[PDB]
Structure 1
Amino acid sequence: DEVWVVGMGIVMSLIVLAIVFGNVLVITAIAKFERLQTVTNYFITSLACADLVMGLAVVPFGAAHILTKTWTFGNFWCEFWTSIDVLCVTASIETLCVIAVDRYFAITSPFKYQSLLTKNKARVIILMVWIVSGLTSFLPIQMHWYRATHQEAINCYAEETCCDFFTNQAYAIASSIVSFYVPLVIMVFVYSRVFQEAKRQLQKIDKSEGEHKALKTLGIIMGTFTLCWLPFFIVNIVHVIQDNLIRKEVYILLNWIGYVNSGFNPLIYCRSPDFRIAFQELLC
């Protein structure tokens, strides 16, 4: 019906607009002002770059493919799109992992933070993260190593309209392990100790002078990442392990839920008063 196609297009355009506007302002504010060029603001720059690439490339063409129902572009041009999707998702999650580790290294070892993070080490860390993300998205896909053998997969591969995702078991497990689960475990172990230290400091202060803030901040941090990406990475292995228990539509919906996370990062991370002033003088 014409109601559905017009109605969904508005949402799929608002998502792109929100992502682009949110992720361009942070980059502009960091670049144009010498106050915010901190060693810990480069990771946010990399995260914003990944989110911007997602907004410019991943979302609009997927929306057009869904609305039109046929991939009018060539067969070559959409393997590039799939590789871009995987690369951007991996580089976005691993950047959050790196930010968490950097935050951990500053509280438990206050006397060594300035002498163990340096502007030279940040570049190396970012380059390693992006390289690791790049050797799990372009190399294994454009070499045609992930393709399945079942009849539907080949019958759809041999058509210039088909670009639906059919993946092998080993790739489906390895990609998920590299992208999500190891960063999830690392982030959990990192963020438990920060809460423990906050509790210790509060208890130490209370005795001498005589915590909703810690729970609220950690909830905002870890209830938007464990709720947006976890449901997808549980079915990403399930639909491969056991026959066809998972429908294609549920897979697609849980995938598009994960793209929305790219539009929330500036709100979660760029809330400091310095960022507020920087945004205020950029506009208005």
Structure 2
Amino acid sequence: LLTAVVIILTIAGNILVIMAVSLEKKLQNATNYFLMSLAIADMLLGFLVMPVSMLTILYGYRWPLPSKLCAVWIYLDVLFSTASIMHLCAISLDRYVAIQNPIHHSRFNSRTKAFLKIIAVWTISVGISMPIPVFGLQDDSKVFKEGSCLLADDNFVLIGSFVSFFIPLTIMVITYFLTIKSLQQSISNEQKACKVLGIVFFLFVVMWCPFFITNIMAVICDVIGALLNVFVWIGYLSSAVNPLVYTLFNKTYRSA
């Protein structure tokens, strides 16, 4: 099965990134600490929610696990996915600040920057996902649809997509545009930086954007469910690629 390789690839890659950060002394910085937090978020995703989704696939969407654990699976999924998305948004904003005015960024670049960034993205990821477990454990009608775990509460779905993906999308489009506008023998390295930024941004858009577009179009409107069933796993594929496209541009990670 195609989903059998994705769990192993995610669990291997994130362990490799965290072991390379812990072992290589040259990779101790604020940005690499934020990247280790990103790898922690996707490793928790690939360990906790991804074989559960494979189990849901192997039973034909009739959920084998009992009904008490549905509201925490949506909680873990939304929490780790919002953590990953806000991690990429904060990385894009920090790259724009560190590329537009490099003197004033390095003037304020303490480890308090990294700790406040991690605190902000995890606080946001907790606070956006807050109505999931309190309103789902006793109220099974809002987190079930025809005997399967799904977010039936579309009033949560529309607003949560709006705060979780589309406002990060409208932030990262602006910061990517202004970072390309600010990158226009350093001229040779700026082209490699532009290529890496383009690959990372368009890969994020391609990996996450079909699922949220069809998720909002589900609430605006069985083809939609069959599209969602594979676009979720396309969304899970971002968490295995995000260690690769954020580390392999630096040769120290490849030498590790």
Count of residue correspondences: 252
2:161 is aligned with 1:219:
no
How many Å separate the matches in 2 of 1:42 and 1:178? 25
- How far the C-alpha of 1:19 sits from its partner, in A, is 0.6
Relative to 1, partners in 2 of residues 1:155 and 1:118: Cα closer, same or farther, differing over 3 Å?
closer
Which runs of structure 2 are paired with 1:1-284 in the superposition (5 Å)? 8=1, 11-69=2-60, 70-137=62-129, 139-144=130-135, 154=141, 157=144, 162-199=147-184, 202=187, 213=192, 215-242=194-221, 246-271=223-248, 272-277=250-255, 279=256
How many Å separate the matches in 2 of 1:21 and 1:261? 14
Further displaced range: 101-110 or 162-171: 162-171
- How far the C-alpha of 1:147 sits from its partner, in A, is 11
Larger helix share, 1 or 2: 2
Normalising by structure 2, report the TM-score.
0.89
Gaps of 5+ in 1: 1-7, 206-210, 280-284
- How far the C-alpha of 1:117 sits from its partner, in A, is 2.3
**Is the partner of 1:225 in helix, strand or coil?**
helix
Q: Confirm or deny: 8 A CA contact 2:14 2:43 kept in the other structure.
A: yes
Q: Confirm or deny: 8 A CA contact 1:58 1:84 kept in the other structure.
A: yes
Question: Which one-letter code corresponds to 1:236 in the other structure?
Answer: N
Further displaced range: 11-20 or 166-175: 166-175
Question: Which one-letter code corresponds to 1:190 in the other structure?
Answer: T
- How far the C-alpha of 1:249 sits from its partner, in A, is 1.4
Residue identity (%): 35
For the aligned residues, what is the CA RMSD?
Answer: 2.6
Normalising by structure 1, report the TM-score.
0.81
How many Å separate the matches in 2 of 1:134 and 1:164? 20
Larger radius of gyration: 1
Relative to 1, partners in 2 of residues 1:197 and 1:253: Cα closer, same or farther, differing over 3 Å?
same
